[PDB]
Design an enzyme around this catalytic site. Structure first.
Site, PDB file in Angstrom:
ATOM      1  N   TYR A 186       4.781  37.713 -22.424  1.00 30.84           N
ATOM      2  CA  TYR A 186       5.521  36.606 -21.798  1.00 30.84           C
ATOM      3  C   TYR A 186       7.002  36.831 -22.106  1.00 30.84           C
ATOM      4  O   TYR A 186       7.333  37.287 -23.196  1.00 30.84           O
ATOM      5  CB  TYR A 186       5.083  35.259 -22.368  1.00 30.84           C
ATOM      6  CG  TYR A 186       3.749  34.723 -21.877  1.00 30.84           C
ATOM      7  CD1 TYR A 186       3.499  34.535 -20.501  1.00 30.84           C
ATOM      8  CD2 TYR A 186       2.727  34.400 -22.789  1.00 30.84           C
ATOM      9  CE1 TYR A 186       2.246  34.040 -20.035  1.00 30.84           C
ATOM     10  CE2 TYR A 186       1.477  33.895 -22.341  1.00 30.84           C
ATOM     11  CZ  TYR A 186       1.245  33.719 -20.967  1.00 30.84           C
ATOM     12  OH  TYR A 186       0.040  33.197 -20.545  1.00 30.84           O
TER      13      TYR A 186
ATOM     14  N   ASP B  63       2.333  42.829 -19.237  1.00 24.82           N
ATOM     15  CA  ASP B  63       3.290  42.899 -20.339  1.00 24.82           C
ATOM     16  C   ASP B  63       3.373  41.492 -20.978  1.00 24.82           C
ATOM     17  O   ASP B  63       2.800  40.540 -20.428  1.00 24.82           O
ATOM     18  CB  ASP B  63       4.649  43.461 -19.847  1.00 24.82           C
ATOM     19  CG  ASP B  63       5.398  42.517 -18.953  1.00 24.82           C
ATOM     20  OD1 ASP B  63       6.609  42.330 -19.193  1.00 24.82           O
ATOM     21  OD2 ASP B  63       4.790  41.993 -18.009  1.00 24.82           O
TER      22      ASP B  63
ATOM     23  N   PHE C 234      -1.743  36.853 -22.778  1.00 29.87           N
ATOM     24  CA  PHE C 234      -1.919  35.518 -22.199  1.00 29.87           C
ATOM     25  C   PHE C 234      -1.941  34.324 -23.158  1.00 29.87           C
ATOM     26  O   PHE C 234      -1.961  33.170 -22.720  1.00 29.87           O
ATOM     27  CB  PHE C 234      -3.125  35.476 -21.246  1.00 29.87           C
ATOM     28  CG  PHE C 234      -3.054  36.498 -20.141  1.00 29.87           C
ATOM     29  CD1 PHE C 234      -3.871  37.642 -20.177  1.00 29.87           C
ATOM     30  CD2 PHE C 234      -2.148  36.349 -19.085  1.00 29.87           C
ATOM     31  CE1 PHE C 234      -3.785  38.637 -19.173  1.00 29.87           C
ATOM     32  CE2 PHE C 234      -2.049  37.344 -18.061  1.00 29.87           C
ATOM     33  CZ  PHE C 234      -2.870  38.487 -18.112  1.00 29.87           C
TER      34      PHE C 234
ATOM     35  N   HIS D 261      -3.683  39.669 -10.989  1.00 33.67           N
ATOM     36  CA  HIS D 261      -3.064  39.035 -12.158  1.00 33.67           C
ATOM     37  C   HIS D 261      -3.117  37.503 -11.994  1.00 33.67           C
ATOM     38  O   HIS D 261      -2.905  36.996 -10.890  1.00 33.67           O
ATOM     39  CB  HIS D 261      -1.613  39.537 -12.311  1.00 33.67           C
ATOM     40  CG  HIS D 261      -0.982  39.206 -13.629  1.00 33.67           C
ATOM     41  ND1 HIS D 261      -0.452  37.966 -13.909  1.00 33.67           N
ATOM     42  CD2 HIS D 261      -0.801  39.952 -14.745  1.00 33.67           C
ATOM     43  CE1 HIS D 261       0.026  37.959 -15.141  1.00 33.67           C
ATOM     44  NE2 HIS D 261      -0.174  39.153 -15.671  1.00 33.67           N
TER      45      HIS D 261
HETATM   46  O1  LIG Z   1       0.601  38.463 -22.344  1.00 29.80           O
HETATM   47  C1  LIG Z   1       0.801  38.378 -21.132  1.00 29.80           C
HETATM   48  C2  LIG Z   1       1.546  37.351 -20.484  1.00 29.80           C
HETATM   49  C3  LIG Z   1       1.732  37.394 -19.160  1.00 29.80           C
HETATM   50  N1  LIG Z   1       1.239  38.401 -18.375  1.00 29.80           N
HETATM   51  C4  LIG Z   1       0.517  39.443 -18.925  1.00 29.80           C
HETATM   52  O2  LIG Z   1       0.086  40.362 -18.260  1.00 29.80           O
HETATM   53  N2  LIG Z   1       0.329  39.367 -20.285  1.00 29.80           N
END
Ligand SMILES: O=c1cc[nH]c(=O)[nH]1
Length: 223
Positions: free
Chosen positions: A66, A64, A77, A187
């Site tokens: 930030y 998801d 990310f 992750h």
């Molecule tokens: O965009 C992002 C940020 C953190 N972790 C995720 O999985 N995606």
DNA sequence: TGTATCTT
DNA sequence: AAAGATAACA
């Protein structure tokens, strides 16, 4: 010009009139009235504004967005300047440094450069309530992002799907493992990075599998 | 405190 | 489902 890129709106339009999507948008709007939701409205679909849908070669799927201020901008990310790379991205850059010989830390966290090359930077869930990781899960976003993955699975051949984390990995059953390449690891967050992300070598492997399908490799340094 | 994943 | 347990660190 708008939130959805031309080609993506054309192929994802069938989802807009569906009950789950109508209700999902209503929920997100209701959350925005009581809480701060990330990313802002205009950046929820930035992943559709970087390249055409049939130019997508690689798909990086995260959990998801930030959950801290001025971080999430619709590309998994990624963080726009002057915001420093968050813990997860610093770990991505560290893996990239050991995996790709030419890669060095770029001094910023904007991943737009990868996205322009055909790397879809998607998250399983596209919004999040401030300071609460995965708060908007199981509300309808997974079915929408399943539609995106399903479209790519059906209308393309030889794609490389990078599924990072348990939640991103749920989409494994929506991809034909014989027609596309699915790479799965933990992750990049400090809380999970040691479980396989460090040493996964997903970046060099993606480029090798791309060259085997006759496609041009991704320049991970082009940021 | 803050940045997943497995167990109960 | 949700919370406790586990787990790694500037
Ligand atoms: O965009 C992002 C940020 C953190 N972790 C995720 O999985 N995606």
């Amino acid at each position: 010009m708008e939130f959805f890129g031309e080609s993506w709106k054309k192929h994802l339009s069938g989802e807009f009139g569906k009950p789950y999507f109508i209700k999902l948008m209503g929920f997100v709007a209701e959350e925005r009235k009581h809480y701060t939701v990330y990313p802002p409205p205009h950046q929820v679909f930035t992943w559709t504004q970087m390249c055409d849908i049939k130019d997508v070669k690689v798909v990086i799927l995260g959990q998801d967005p930030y959950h801290g201020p001025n971080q999430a901008h619709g590309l998994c990310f990624s963080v726009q300047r002057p915001v420093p790379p968050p813990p997860s991205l610093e770990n991505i850059y560290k893996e990239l440094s050991t995996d790709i010989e030419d890669f060095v830390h770029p001094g910023h966290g904007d991943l737009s450069g990868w996205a322009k090359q055909g790397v879809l930077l998607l998250n399983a869930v596209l919004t999040v309530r401030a300071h609460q990781a995965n708060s908007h899960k199981e509300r309808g976003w997974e079915q929408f992002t399943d539609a995106v993955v399903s479209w790519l699975n059906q209308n393309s051949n030889g794609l490389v799907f990078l599924l990072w984390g348990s939640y991103a990995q749920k989409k494994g059953s929506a991809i034909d493992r014989k027609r596309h390449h699915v790479l799965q690891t933990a992750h990049p967050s400090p809380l999970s990075v040691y479980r396989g992300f460090f040493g996964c070598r997903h970046f060099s492997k993606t480029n090798e599998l791309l060259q085997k399908s006759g496609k041009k490799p991704i320049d991970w340094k082009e940021l």
